[PDB]
């Protein structure tokens, strides 16, 4: 995974994420949308063949928090939820 | 909060109910199981003799399609970079008969064909077949030969069948024949859609007004089956650990920007 | 539509000009966007076909509404350089915002564009007559009245 | 998949769907010219005129014939043969693979022709996995080329656990008026569920209503539609979708045999214009 | 030519179940019950066993060395 | 000028591109890596044109 | 150049030169058609 | 007389039209993700067809790098 900043200014950050696809991109975006301070966020795959592993993101906040902090919060929430689901599954299966 | 309840556990499959997560998380889990969980599979074949009626590129594909058991403790299958450990499968056959997957010999006792009754090729009299297959770890997204099974889910829904319908007894009988749980109540019969429930043509008129279906939020019925490469619980745990590892790596790369 | 081609086995030829004058002529005279209007009847030729029209109808049909995630995803997919979503149109149950398809489509149009006509889907001429009367009375009727008398 | 194009699953292709092989037989003859001067099979030494690169004769045995199950990639010599200089030299007249083709040598046959001279035939087989541009067609006249290959996890899946092998465009059904395709789609899934094949004779075949009733009896909707979930978003589509089993055939108009490029090339004699044909 | 190892659509290993299915259906058993007993439930798998034709036996006679 | 028809603009751009390729200097600073033709289009868009057209 | 050539009909191990041979035949069944057998070297094919 | 006249004769089909260099032909597949004024070209065709470029001051670096790439890597 690599982060290539397309453009960064004010409360906007646009970047590629090399080495990823819909699997993690959609989860990250849907986790981000829960944050009340994120005005706009989305992702896209520019071309299904050439850019199959290079999703492009966009994050816009309201100035209360910087985008790279909202991304950290989203990733931390994803990690916590995955850990909780793993614990529940381990308890249930045995 | 998050909880997991298991409905049915067969030998090579498991069907459980996941509760308390968003649709995105369920789709991420499904795609991670389908594409990210690694297994062992044949990659290259070194033929010495092939007098069978099938070409080399067909026997190679048939060998690739065979599922091989994968150890869990020896390797760290949840890492983001996979080992290059290689296991060699050899074979020597001759004479009339059918060459089965059980005739393959492995260097490593932990990795060997799961099903010993898969036919590979029919050798006639005098035809010989000798080769040395090479197996290595790989992910399901690169090639379908590495897929550790098949996974799908569905919404957890309840179908309301009002008793004002003149023939709700037939609907209840059909539902019980299918096998879905049925919870009888006054004025409405409740059907839990463990498996899909398509109402017949005659009752299609009542759809919506009388027969209406509600969706229980954040609840999904998962179905995971494996071909024997890994136990199902190992598959699910490995997928979840892979998701955690990806989240941590993203955190690290994002922090690198500051 | 210009090439009159279908993806059922058709083959096409590609030519590469070699001299600078030939390249300049190809770049200035024969660019694709220069031939949007047909010289046979003075109308457009390079336009939407099949799924474009059908999806346009699905998007801007009456009763179509889209959630927050769908709106953001489709706007990013189209390529529009939007930065903040417009004000929600209708609030459904559970307090989730909803946006009508007309707003999403209007985000793609120029700022100063005014046109009215009858399309093929017209079946009740009375509604169109009433709308035409409203527009013709004063050339800028209040938007809320037009939304009241809307009709596909 | 617009304008009569189809979308094919990638995992299904990787499991052996529509995978084919292509054979082509090359032929060489040791002609016996009048006067005793005859051709011969050998490894052409660099002395001879027309001697191509050394790498071209790299897998020929000392008798001048290629080894079976060797890999050729285009312009590679299959049979080394030198002709008399008669129109102290020796013209090179080897038989080589077509410039744009590729494959593996399958069999080599050595025969004595009718005139008493030698005759050698070599066949080269090539694997042809489906790719963009390959043409598929159904028995009801619907034709198309593969428009995109989609990973399995991006394909939709029905609520009963079925992932489509191939996706066609709904706009191709009307204005083509091939209701037989839809009837066959219903019948294929009915046959597969019931475990017996379905009669589809011209005028005495199984009527459609019987197939729809049987499909209803097996736990599926009589209309043949099902509920699927979107591959990317992961939530069910608003409308239920039609899905079934249809018999498809892979045609021999494959893009590997139609692509052609020319940068400088040779020219004709009289007009000195570029030659005509992909082979030359 | 010969029975495929895995179902083209979902990937379930069905290579070993063809001969048993053929023998049971030839004996007189109802094919639907035989297919249900073998474990094949989704019709994508059942199609592969139902429509398969064994052609390895009649091309084995011509040998090429 | 007064008005440039499509053919005249194409002719002028082609002539300028050919001159630039053959060794003529560029009267406008240009980004690195550009082809001579696109340099000609940039020059025309800037408005500096050294070639005039003769009308009957 | 001595070389091995399997027979077309009986599949027998016929070994004979071809550059110098004037009449080509299988010395067992009289066939005029022979194969060139596959070599005994290891070939490597990708299992893709 | 017959050499000059006819569809395949000299006058038409030989000066009016002729085989040309720097051309290619292949099947067409849809792609809606590119602009309407763009064409997707196979990488194989690009390696064969060429465009002569004169080395000037503003493109010496790119041309030098692409010459360094050789005829087997793509941007060469
Ligand atoms: Mg056509
Ligand atoms: Zn299946
Ligand atoms: Zn013999």
Swiss-Prot record, chain A:
DNA-dependent RNA polymerase (RNAP) catalyzes the transcription of DNA into RNA using the four ribonucleoside triphosphates as substrates. The keyword Nucleotidyltransferase applies. InterPro entries: RBP11-like, RBP11-like_dimer, RNA_pol_Rpb11_13-16kDa_CS, Rpo11-like. It catalyses: RNA(n) + a ribonucleoside 5'-triphosphate = RNA(n+1) + diphosphate. This is DNA-directed RNA polymerase subunit Rpo11. GO terms for cellular component: cytoplasm; DNA-directed RNA polymerase complex. Pfam families: RNA_pol_L_2. It comes from Pyrococcus furiosus (strain ATCC 43587 / DSM 3638 / JCM 8422 / Vc1). Its main location: cytoplasm. GO terms for molecular function: DNA binding; DNA-directed RNA polymerase activity; protein dimerization activity.
Swiss-Prot record, chain B:
GO terms for biological process: DNA-templated transcription. It catalyses: RNA(n) + a ribonucleoside 5'-triphosphate = RNA(n+1) + diphosphate. Its EC number is 2.7.7.6. GO terms for molecular function: DNA binding; DNA-directed RNA polymerase activity; protein dimerization activity. It is found in: Cytoplasm. Gene3D superfamilies: 3.30.70.3110, DNA-directed RNA polymerase, insert domain, RNA polymerase, RBP11-like subunit. GO terms for cellular component: cytoplasm; DNA-directed RNA polymerase complex. Keywords: Cytoplasm, DNA-directed RNA polymerase, Nucleotidyltransferase, Transcription, Transferase. Part of the RNA polymerase complex. DNA-dependent RNA polymerase (RNAP) catalyzes the transcription of DNA into RNA using the four ribonucleoside triphosphates as substrates. Belongs to the archaeal Rpo3/eukaryotic RPB3 RNA polymerase subunit family. HAMAP family: RNApol_arch_Rpo3. This is DNA-directed RNA polymerase subunit Rpo3. It comes from Pyrococcus furiosus (strain ATCC 43587 / DSM 3638 / JCM 8422 / Vc1). The lineage of its organism: Archaea, Methanobacteriati, Methanobacteriota, Thermococci, Thermococcales. The gene is rpo3.
UniProtKB/Swiss-Prot annotation, chain E:
GO terms for molecular function: DNA binding; DNA-directed RNA polymerase activity; zinc ion binding. SUPFAM superfamilies: RNA polymerase subunit RPB10. It is found in: Cytoplasm. Its cofactor is Zn(2+). It catalyses: RNA(n) + a ribonucleoside 5'-triphosphate = RNA(n+1) + diphosphate. Its main location: cytoplasm. The keyword Manganese does not apply. InterPro entries: RNA_pol_su_RPB10, RNA_pol_suN_Zn-BS, RPABC5/Rpb10. Its EC number is 2.7.7.6. Pfam families: RNA_pol_N. Keywords: Cytoplasm, DNA-directed RNA polymerase, Metal-binding, Nucleotidyltransferase, Transcription, Transferase, Zinc. GO terms for cellular component: cytoplasm; DNA-directed RNA polymerase complex. One of its GO terms (biological process) is DNA-templated transcription. Binds 1 zinc ion. DNA-dependent RNA polymerase (RNAP) catalyzes the transcription of DNA into RNA using the four ribonucleoside triphosphates as substrates. Part of the RNA polymerase complex. PANTHER family: DNA-DIRECTED RNA POLYMERASES I, II, AND III SUBUNIT RPABC5 (PTHR23431:SF3), DNA-DIRECTED RNA POLYMERASES I, II, AND III SUBUNIT RPABC5 FAMILY MEMBER (PTHR23431). Belongs to the archaeal Rpo10/eukaryotic RPB10 RNA polymerase subunit family. This is DNA-directed RNA polymerase subunit Rpo10. It comes from Pyrococcus furiosus (strain ATCC 43587 / DSM 3638 / JCM 8422 / Vc1). The lineage of its organism: Archaea, Methanobacteriati, Methanobacteriota, Thermococci, Thermococcales.
Swiss-Prot record, chain F:
Pfam families: RNA_pol_Rpb6. It is an enzyme of class 2 (transferase). One of its GO terms (molecular function) is DNA-directed RNA polymerase activity. Its EC number is 2.7.7.6. Disulfide bonds: none annotated. PROSITE patterns: RNA_POL_K_14KD. It is found in: Cytoplasm. Its main location: cytoplasm. Keywords: Cytoplasm, DNA-directed RNA polymerase, Nucleotidyltransferase, Transcription, Transferase. GO terms for biological process: transcription by RNA polymerase I; transcription by RNA polymerase II; tRNA transcription by RNA polymerase III. It comes from the Archaea. It catalyses: RNA(n) + a ribonucleoside 5'-triphosphate = RNA(n+1) + diphosphate. One of its GO terms (cellular component) is DNA-directed RNA polymerase complex. InterPro entries: DNA-dir_RNA_polK_14-18kDa_CS (IPR020708), Pol_omega/Rpo6/RPB6 (IPR006110), RPB6/omega-like_sf (IPR036161), Rpo6/Rpb6 (IPR006111). The keyword Transferase applies. NCBIfam families: PRK01099.1-3. Part of the RNA polymerase complex. Belongs to the archaeal Rpo6/eukaryotic RPB6 RNA polymerase subunit family. DNA-dependent RNA polymerase (RNAP) catalyzes the transcription of DNA into RNA using the four ribonucleoside triphosphates as substrates. This is DNA-directed RNA polymerase subunit Rpo6. It comes from Pyrococcus furiosus (strain ATCC 43587 / DSM 3638 / JCM 8422 / Vc1).
């Amino acid at each position: 995974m690599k982060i290539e900043v397309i453009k960064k200014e004010e409360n906007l950050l646009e970047f590629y994420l090399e080495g990823e696809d819909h699997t993690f991109a959609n989860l990250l975006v849907e986790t981000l949308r829960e944050n009340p301070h994120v005005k706009f966020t989305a992702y896209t795959i520019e071309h299904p063949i050439t850019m199959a592993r290079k999703p492009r993101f966009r994050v816009v906040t309201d100035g209360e928090i910087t985008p790279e902090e909202a991304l950290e919060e989203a990733a931390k929430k994803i990690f916590e939820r995955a850990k909780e689901v793993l614990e529940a599954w381990e308890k249930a299966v045995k | 909060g998050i909880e997991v309840q298991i409905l049915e556990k067969k030998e090579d499959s498991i069907k459980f109910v996941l509760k308390g997560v968003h649709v995105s998380f369920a789709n991420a889990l499904r795609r991670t199981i389908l594409g990210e969980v690694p297994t062992f599979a044949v990659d290259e074949v070194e033929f010495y003799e092939n007098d069978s009626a099938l070409f080399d590129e067909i026997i190679a594909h048939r060998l690739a399609m065979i599922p091989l058991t994968t150890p869990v403790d020896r390797f760290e299958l949840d890492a983001l970079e996979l080992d290059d450990y290689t296991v060699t499968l050899s074979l020597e056959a001759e004479g009339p008969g059918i060459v089965y997957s059980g005739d393959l010999k492995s260097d490593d006792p932990d990795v060997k064909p799961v099903n010993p009754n898969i036919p590979i090729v029919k050798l006639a009299e005098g035809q010989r077949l000798v080769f040395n297959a090479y197996a290595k770890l790989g992910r399901g997204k690169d090639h379908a030969k590495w897929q550790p099974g098949f996974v799908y889910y569905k919404y957890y829904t309840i179908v309301h069948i009002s008793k004002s319908i003149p023939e709700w007894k037939e609907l209840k009988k059909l539902a019980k024949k299918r096998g879905l749980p049925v919870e009888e109540t006054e004025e409405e019969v409740l059907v839990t859609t463990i498996k899909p429930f398509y109402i017949p043509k005659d009752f299609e008129e009542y759809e919506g007004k009388e027969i209406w279906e509600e969706i229980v939020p954040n609840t999904y019925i998962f179905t995971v089956e494996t071909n024997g490469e890994l136990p199902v619980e190992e598959i699910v745990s490995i997928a979840l650990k892979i998701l955690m590892r990806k989240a941590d790596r993203f955190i690290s790369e994002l922090q690198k920007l500051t | 539509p210009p090439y009159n081609a279908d993806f059922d086995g058709d083959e096409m030829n590609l030519h590469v000009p070699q001299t600078e004058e030939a390249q300049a002529e190809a770049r200035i005279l024969m660019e694709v966007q220069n031939h949007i209007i047909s010289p046979r009847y003075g109308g457009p030729i390079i336009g939407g076909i099949q799924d474009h029209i059908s999806g346009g109808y699905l998007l801007t049909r009456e009763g179509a509404y889209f959630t927050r995630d769908e709106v953001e995803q489709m706007l990013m997919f189209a390529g529009v350089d939007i930065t903040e979503l417009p004000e929600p149109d209708k609030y459904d149950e559970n307090g989730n915002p909803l946006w009508s398809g007309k707003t999403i489509f209007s985000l793609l149009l120029p700022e100063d564009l005014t046109v009215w006509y009858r399309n093929k889907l017209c079946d009740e001429p009375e509604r169109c007559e009433a709308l035409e009367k409203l527009i013709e009375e004063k050339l800028m009727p209040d938007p809320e009245e037009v939304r009241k008398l809307a009709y596909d | 998949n617009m304008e009569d194009a189809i979308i094919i699953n990638k995992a299904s292709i990787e499991r052996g769907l529509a995978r084919s092989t292509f054979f082509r037989t090359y032929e060489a003859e040791e002609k016996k010219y009048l006067g005793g001067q005859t051709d011969k099979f050998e490894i052409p030494d660099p002395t001879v005129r027309g001697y191509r690169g050394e790498k071209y004769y790299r897998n020929l045995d000392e008798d001048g014939l290629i080894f079976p199950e060797s890999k050729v990639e285009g312009k590679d010599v299959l049979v080394g043969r030198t002709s008399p200089p008669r129109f102290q030299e020796r013209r090179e007249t080897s038989v080589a693979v077509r410039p744009s083709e590729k494959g593996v040598v399958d069999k080599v046959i050595i025969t004595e022709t009718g005139d008493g001279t030698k005759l050698v035939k070599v066949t080269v087989r090539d694997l042809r996995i489906p790719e963009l541009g390959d043409k598929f067609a159904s028995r009801h006249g619907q034709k198309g080329v593969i428009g995109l290959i989609v990973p399995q996890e991006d394909m939709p899946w029905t609520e009963s656990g079925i992932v489509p092998d191939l996706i066609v465009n709904p706009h191709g059904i009307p204005s083509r008026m091939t209701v037989g395709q839809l009837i066959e789609a219903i019948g294929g899934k009915v046959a597969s569920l019931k475990g017996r094949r379905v009669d589809g004779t011209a005028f005495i075949g199984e009527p459609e209503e019987k197939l729809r009733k049987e499909l209803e009896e097996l736990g599926f909707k009589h209309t043949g539609r099902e509920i699927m979930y979107d591959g990317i978003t992961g939530k069910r589509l608003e409308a239920d979708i039609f899905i079934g089993v249809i018999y498809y055939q892979r045609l021999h108009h494959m893009v590997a045999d139609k692509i052609h490029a020319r940068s400088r090339g040779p020219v004709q004699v009289l007009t000195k214009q570029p030659t005509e044909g992909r082979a030359r | 030519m010969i029975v495929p190892v895995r179902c083209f659509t979902c990937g379930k290993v069905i290579g070993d179940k063809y001969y048993e299915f053929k023998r049971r259906v030839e004996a007189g058993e109802d094919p639907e019950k035989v297919l249900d007993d073998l474990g094949l439930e989704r019709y994508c798998c059942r199609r592969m066993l139902l429509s398969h034709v064994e052609l390895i036996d009649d091309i084995m006679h011509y040998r090429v060395y | 000028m007064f008005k440039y028809t499509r053919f005249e603009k194409a002719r002028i751009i082609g002539a300028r591109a050919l001159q630039i390729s053959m060794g003529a200097p560029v009267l406008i600073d240009v980004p690195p890596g550009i082809t001579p033709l696109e340099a000609a289009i940039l020059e025309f868009e800037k408005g500096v044109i050294p070639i005039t057209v003769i009308r009957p | 150049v001595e070389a091995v050539y399997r027979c077309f009909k009986c599949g027998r191990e016929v070994k004979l030169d071809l550059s110098i041979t004037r009449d080509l035949r299988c010395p067992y069944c009289g066939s005029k058609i022979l194969y060139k057998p596959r070599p005994k070297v290891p070939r490597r094919v990708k299992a893709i | 007389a017959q050499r000059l006249k006819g569809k395949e004769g000299r006058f038409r089909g030989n000066l009016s039209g002729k085989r040309v260099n720097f051309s290619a032909r292949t099947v067409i597949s849809p792609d809606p993700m590119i602009s309407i004024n763009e064409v997707g070209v196979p990488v194989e065709v690009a390696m064969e067809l060429t465009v002569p470029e004169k080395v000037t001051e503003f493109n010496i670096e790119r041309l030098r790098k692409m010459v360094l790439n050789g005829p087997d890597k793509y941007p060469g």
